[PDB]
Amino acid sequence: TFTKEDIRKFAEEENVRYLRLQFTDILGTIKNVEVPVSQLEKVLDNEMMFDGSSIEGFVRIEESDMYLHPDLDTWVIFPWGKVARLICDVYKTDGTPFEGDPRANLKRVLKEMEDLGFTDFNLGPEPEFFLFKLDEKGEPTLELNDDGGYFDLAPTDLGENCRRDIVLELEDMGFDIEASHHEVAPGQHEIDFKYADAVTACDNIQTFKLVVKTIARKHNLHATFMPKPLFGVNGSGMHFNVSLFKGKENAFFDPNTEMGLTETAYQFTAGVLKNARGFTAVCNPLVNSYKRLVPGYEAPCYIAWSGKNRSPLIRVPSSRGLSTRIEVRSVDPAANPYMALAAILEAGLDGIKNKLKVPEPVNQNIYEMNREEREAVGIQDLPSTLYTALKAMRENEVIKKALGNHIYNQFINSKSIEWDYYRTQVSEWERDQYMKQY
Amino acid sequence: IARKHNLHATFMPKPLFGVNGSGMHFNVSLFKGKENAFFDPNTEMGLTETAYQFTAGVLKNARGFTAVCNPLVNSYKRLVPGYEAPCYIAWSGKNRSPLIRVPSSRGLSTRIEVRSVDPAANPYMALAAILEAGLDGIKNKLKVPEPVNQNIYEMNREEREAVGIQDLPSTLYTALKAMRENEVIKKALGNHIYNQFINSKSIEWDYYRTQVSEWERDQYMKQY
């Protein structure tokens, strides 16, 4: 926790000369307003003005005027005078928070969750990213930084070790890193965080993306969180381990049952499974995202839960006690953390307050099953394209309630425009298959 | 500093086709003694009749000073629809591309934003022209037209002119033609500056108009 005096003292002792008022749009892009430190007081008075229509992304029409209210607890100084940042909420000219801000939407969802008796919603993300080599002109190429495999010691100790430098710099900034390892695909890396509250977790995800993209550029590399940059190899996921808490106590933990799962946890996973098709578009917002959702690369392709499976939509880790959690594996690093977390929390709460019955967990004898038999059993498939994902999203009320009318409509319009632009392109695959056979 | 970083900084109004151009929007405010003359502390809108007269005067002579505020041939490649640059003479508090915008700030910070200025314009001459137009509106007690709102996006030029929304000049040639017919711009600039600017811009346009563009060679030379 920090106050105005703490911020002034930090600016004075550390010789901060540049301030970044950081926020996000509906597309998850990290936006910021730069300010000289001489404006610090005006920053602390919630008097900084900016467009505010930038939150709409590329579907903005008219320039507005909106105020930035910083959150003093998000203060941190970058290790590269010095530059400091503050994460700000967006307020309208009438003093009320802007309804199109994902952070405010997540805060509202958490506030409405608090009326159900739960106090905290903890999230631990597992973001995976790719590192590509840069050419002479400084553009990213398609060559990977290394050639390691799952949990390999590929970038050993000498010469780049970009992952190690990222971890150390995040530790210096005040982050809580659990562990890091090489991912399955060559040049793919994963860094895991310790669990934190929802807003702090999403802020940490945004800051982690920014820090990774900066440090990779420092090492003459390019870091990408694209869900499926390369065909034929593993994609990048951002699995969300979530847990509910109502007062110094995990609500998912059953200390008496051998399985150790509370009926609340079963209701939560039933609700997440029920509305999985509804929030697929939000959790997988890119056209490329659905190129990751293909079988054989551990990405979930149908709606099921298990404790031990190759690619379940929901996984329950073996940990128990205060660390029992539910893992949603459909989220990709390109998704907006606030919106995806709000959608998942709303689906879980919808399952909780409807007392839904969780279906039977899947096990090894589902690998030999076609889609017809899978649907006969009761396992639905995730949407395979962004078009069909938007179609499914337009038919779900829980996602609309989670996002709010403004964010829901803007996201639908943006994704419809993006898909419309994508669908008219003639791909190289079509030119390879046709133009000689037809 | 751009040259220090092995870069090139340009204030060209429209260096690239198909992307946004560069503007130099001017937020101006009048003061008569430790007090903003545009602020009305009693009205809900908070704008003084002086501010309305000023914006009416700026709107009235917008065609007159367009050449000074947009002095390059390239400038009028920015004044095309779809890139937030103003294309017709109107004012609003919330619009995509109004010529004059009134920011929501009030008190001592209330101001009027003229958005037609580009960074290639001479700041002294553009500011003098804008101030002279505003003062001409003030001392003539002109009535500001109705502000434009969202239902102007669906309007052709004919309906826009029927309503009363004039268009900014589309070329430097027509901008000079309009400037030669305005007395306020001549009064603002002075005879010497007015004549020298007109001669310089006429010579520049004359040199530009005789060039054969690559667009012409792409469209023609095979079709004709």
């Binding site: 590329f58 579907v59 903005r60 029409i61 425009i417 993006e418 632009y421 | 198909g18 992307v19 946004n20 629809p81 779809g82 890139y83 937030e84 995509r96 996006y153």
Partner: peptide, 11 residues
Amino acid sequence: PINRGDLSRFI
């Protein structure tokens, strides 16, 4: 499109 400038990435 009205917001051509904001859609320049797709064109």
